[PDB]
Amino acid sequence: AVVKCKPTSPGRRHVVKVVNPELHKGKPFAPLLEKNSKSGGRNNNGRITTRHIGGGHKQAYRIVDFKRNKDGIPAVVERLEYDPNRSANIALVLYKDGERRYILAPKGLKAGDQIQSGVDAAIKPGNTLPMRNIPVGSTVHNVEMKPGKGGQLARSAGTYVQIVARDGAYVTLRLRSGEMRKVEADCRATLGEVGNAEHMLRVLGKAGAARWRGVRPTVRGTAMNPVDHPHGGGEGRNFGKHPVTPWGVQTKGKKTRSNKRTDKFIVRRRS
Amino acid sequence: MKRTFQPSVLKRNRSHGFRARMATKNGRQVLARRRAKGRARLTVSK
RNA sequence: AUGUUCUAACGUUGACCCGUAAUCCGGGUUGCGGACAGUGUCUGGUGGGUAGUUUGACUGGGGCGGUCU
RNA sequence: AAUUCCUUGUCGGGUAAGUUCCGACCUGCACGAAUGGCGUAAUGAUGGCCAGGCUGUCUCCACCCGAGACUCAGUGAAAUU
RNA sequence: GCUCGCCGGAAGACCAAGGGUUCCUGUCCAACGUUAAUCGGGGCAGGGUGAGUCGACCCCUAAGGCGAGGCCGAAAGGCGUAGUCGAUGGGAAACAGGUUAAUAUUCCUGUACUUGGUGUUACUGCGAAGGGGGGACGGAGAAGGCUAUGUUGGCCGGGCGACGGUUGUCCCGGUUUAAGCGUGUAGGCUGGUUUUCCAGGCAAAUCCGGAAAAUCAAGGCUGAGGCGUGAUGACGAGGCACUACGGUGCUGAAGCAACAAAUGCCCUGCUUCCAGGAAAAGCCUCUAAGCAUCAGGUAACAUCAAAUCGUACCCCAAACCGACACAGGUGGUCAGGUAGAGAAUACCAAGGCGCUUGAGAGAACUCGGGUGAAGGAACUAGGCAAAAUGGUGCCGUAACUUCGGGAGAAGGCACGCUGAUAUGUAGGUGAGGUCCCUCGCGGAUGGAGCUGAAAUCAGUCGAAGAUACCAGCUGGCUGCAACUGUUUAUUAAAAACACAGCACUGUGCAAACACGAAAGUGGACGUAUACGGUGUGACGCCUGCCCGGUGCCGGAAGGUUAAUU
RNA sequence: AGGACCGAACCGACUAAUGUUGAAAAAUUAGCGGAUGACUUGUGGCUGGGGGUGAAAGGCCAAUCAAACCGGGAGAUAGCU
RNA sequence: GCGGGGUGGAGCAGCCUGGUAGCUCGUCGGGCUCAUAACCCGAAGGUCGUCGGUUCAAAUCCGGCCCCCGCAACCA
Ligand SMILES: [Mg+2]
Ligand SMILES: [Mg+2]
Ligand SMILES: [Mg+2]
Ligand SMILES: [Mg+2]
Ligand SMILES: [Mg+2]
Ligand SMILES: [Mg+2]
Ligand SMILES: [Mg+2]
Ligand SMILES: [Mg+2]
Ligand SMILES: [Mg+2]
Ligand SMILES: [Mg+2]
Ligand SMILES: [Mg+2]
Ligand SMILES: [Mg+2]
Ligand SMILES: [Mg+2]
Ligand SMILES: [Mg+2]
Ligand SMILES: [Mg+2]
Ligand SMILES: [Mg+2]
Ligand SMILES: [Mg+2]
Ligand SMILES: [Mg+2]
Ligand SMILES: [Mg+2]
Ligand SMILES: [Mg+2]
Ligand SMILES: [Mg+2]
Ligand SMILES: [Mg+2]
Ligand SMILES: [Mg+2]
Ligand SMILES: [Mg+2]
Ligand SMILES: [Mg+2]
Ligand SMILES: [Mg+2]
Ligand SMILES: [Mg+2]
Ligand SMILES: [Mg+2]
Ligand SMILES: [Mg+2]
Ligand SMILES: [Mg+2]
Ligand SMILES: [Mg+2]
Ligand SMILES: [Mg+2]
């Protein structure tokens, strides 16, 4: 549910919170946790390679099952959990053989719901099948791009793909971007949409809330000196040049895709 | 006011000590120069 | 010269086996691509991203104007 | 007008008297709509202006208490030439 | 030595880091010491640091470093796997009293504890480079229960006062005791227990996970404090005897209770929130290969071992960082009284100091303060500076507003002491007794003592009762930036930067993009509700016309046009 | 509850005066701002010079910064003093 | 200081590249209408800022003057 904070201080006036009462209040399932320490956006040369990354809260990594290859064995949803590592919530599921795993939580999934993977699974949200076995027109998420590799497409809160066509060995997918893409029919997908669609309605409200998420400030190129950035310079507010990145490439319209290896799979670009 | 030299024996030894010098070709060139010059104290190691 | 089809070069940041106590690497089996991609030499375009430099003299101070055979 | 040269524009307010301030006017040298326009409660060691209190800020200084300056003994510089 | 003054959330004490003999004694005073020096952190000589338990080392890992092979690179080299290092983090165990000139949880005295070896006994399934558990984790908040600690009474020992009074409702001092071991408490958490099964935990497992059944309800785990013992002891005022008159020797009373009470402890708890909160070993358990009257395991005794290195002294400083015995800088720990909300402030304790030139004088002028007739911003670029305001309770409070604010708006009134209510009240705390019980560290009753606001009424002193210290000036109109934040170390703190929000635009994952001759790495163990770039800058009302130029995007006939031939 | 309020420690640096051969190559005194957070701080680590890092001031990178320091080319060159 | 412009009543061409004044609107005359506007048909109207120079000949080319626009007017 989406709740607007009362303006008892100027940092609270604009805050809008997404509060989900279904989420587990306790600690996560410890056998499926590992550490993931922070980078500051620095590579193995030690240099900043992605700007504006630093600080924020410590976070444990939850091992999420994006492969969904434990076929033929039913699982029951134990609880939904907050995952700091992504926009979607995750669900702890218990397989009938006694194994527990985390999955991405689809829309509508609640504790006690039964799920299954494999060729003979029912066409029901949270069930995973090869897209050969999934009806054309279906909404799916967590879509594999290569068979066995694990889901890579439509994993963010509220996302999904539509299976628009099936032609031999391949299915055509409409992606959230608007791209039409071919994928091998043996690739798995999970029925339904990713949950937590209200994610996008949140309003952080204040500068510090972005700092908590490990985002450091952006300084505009036009606020700099010429030595620092192409936009830098001027006595007063001046510009008078075509917008570019800090490294001099045009940054308002110029296309940057260059991958002739994967062009064959793209039926229609997002446009 | 806080001045530039803030001593730490661990940082001294790790930064400029004999083993640090020996670890790289350019460090070994430092030692070679200092031996050739005939320095009494090759490194900060004490 | 296009178009298709193929596999056998080449790709794989799919899976699985082995070295092996190892998310490296290599070998193996398979799948998927496939003479494309990518790389080398040559070549047109673009290229203040970067570099080296040039940007005259006269002049009732210099600039600006004017001049220069 | 953080923008207006002419300019202390003009008219009104506030003052005995106001090149500043506030409100109008439009004749915009040379405002203007995300190099955003116009508003805006709250906020500000932010710029302007007005009042009450308060005062040695001032008319216009006086006196006092201490540390130096001054004399004595000891030690003992400097720039410069 | 006596007086005086100063610090006392420090200018006292204890450390770490850093330093290194500055420590303690004798001796010397040339140089050092901003003066003299008999003195010294100075010179010279001698002395002084004692550990199974404190720390290091050691075991374990974080970020990170190095890195067999490997991959890559003219060379040098780069990157990285297996590994191996790397604390600022996890991992056994000791306390009290006494002692030196100078060390002490180290010496000594008393009383403990821990881990390993080895042996005798009694049993007995042991076995890991593997599985599982545990270690093991956030912020804020709220309490209850305690204690350190203090206060007062009682008790004990001393006093009966330089000047009126002072055998008391009087004055001064003491009233201290550990670890350990027993107890298992206030409180926290958790149903036990037994059977049967089983696509899981890289193989197995009796372990863990799951499933189905019995059975029964108290099982267990954790835990401050208290209490008991340790302790017939230790310590103890003060007296007494020496004295080398510095100090040693000797002895030794009382040693309780109530109340108050931490920011410490229970508490790694509990409640709640979103930003979702290390790792590995020790440790516990399970088995595999193996071994099987052998090892191995476990228990109980008995012995033996616990090496090495640090340990002086300074440490908010004259010993460290600042060229100085330099108004500077420097992490952690301790936390007495009265007043107070308080770690503010004032005065004090314990403790420590008077800051290494003095003596006079009492000119101008400079510095830091005090007070000022009448006036009251006339000063000045400008109320700059100073003056003023200041507490608590109550009454009261405007425009405007995003309904939170504005607001401590503004303005006002009370305030000391003494008595009464009430020889001390409401409250808090609670002894004995009285009972009850699954007899405890139990319950109920009960109220002794102890503590103790706040108010009203009545008096009363002063010029003045928030008397000192301490402690908002306030209002009106306006520009700019929404706000909190950031910035030119050392002349600019702002209207600049950032910001939540907005928009454009790239990017389909081997993403774009960035660092890298490369291999790789970041982006991200993310996936378009995601990431990157660019502009704008909360919110409200909105954001008009122009594609000629110049960029970009799309097209692709025609012309022109490279290497090539 | 809160980048809430008032206020010590702590972090900072708005005003004045002093100092300016300083007590000090950036301080002191009196006032001043934040003070549960985009806070502050210890210990270790990482990024290297046309390079880093920068809530952006050409700031900072050992009292040095519109291109650090050190050594070398090196007795650079100097129609200039 | 440096560029630019002064052409029928209005706005605007013709200047370069000497001989030659165009365009749209307005004006006037006739029509259409009951009248007016509209609309139709026919006309008139700038020796070209002024003054000189040059040339066989000047809107034109050169110079002065007058007028009206720009720009520039700086560093201590
Ligand atoms: Mg994240
Ligand atoms: Mg942004
Ligand atoms: Mg700038
Ligand atoms: Mg540039
Ligand atoms: Mg400008
Ligand atoms: Mg250039
Ligand atoms: Mg050259
Ligand atoms: Mg040049
Ligand atoms: Mg010249
Ligand atoms: Mg003016
Ligand atoms: Mg006036
Ligand atoms: Mg006005
Ligand atoms: Mg503007
Ligand atoms: Mg627009
Ligand atoms: Mg003298
Ligand atoms: Mg104090
Ligand atoms: Mg010595
Ligand atoms: Mg001494
Ligand atoms: Mg002498
Ligand atoms: Mg002397
Ligand atoms: Mg000495
Ligand atoms: Mg490592
Ligand atoms: Mg390496
Ligand atoms: Mg090697
Ligand atoms: Mg190790
Ligand atoms: Mg340590
Ligand atoms: Mg001592
Ligand atoms: Mg007590
Ligand atoms: Mg506290
Ligand atoms: Mg000591
Ligand atoms: Mg000092
Ligand atoms: Mg001194």
Ligand SMILES: [Mg+2]
């Ligand atoms: Mg500090």
Ligand SMILES: [Mg+2]
């Ligand atoms: Mg005097």
Ligand SMILES: [Mg+2]
């Ligand atoms: Mg004075």
Ligand SMILES: [Mg+2]
């Ligand atoms: Mg005064």
Ligand SMILES: [Mg+2]
């Ligand atoms: Mg007066």
Ligand SMILES: [Mg+2]
């Ligand atoms: Mg008076």
Ligand SMILES: [Mg+2]
């Ligand atoms: Mg005046």
Ligand SMILES: [Mg+2]
């Ligand atoms: Mg005057």
Ligand SMILES: [Mg+2]
């Ligand atoms: Mg003032």
Ligand SMILES: [Mg+2]
């Ligand atoms: Mg004052």
Ligand SMILES: [Mg+2]
């Ligand atoms: Mg104004």
Ligand SMILES: [Mg+2]
């Ligand atoms: Mg602001």
Ligand SMILES: [Mg+2]
């Ligand atoms: Mg601020």
Ligand SMILES: [Mg+2]
């Ligand atoms: Mg400055």
Ligand SMILES: [Mg+2]
């Ligand atoms: Mg990658």
Ligand SMILES: [Mg+2]
């Ligand atoms: Mg802006």
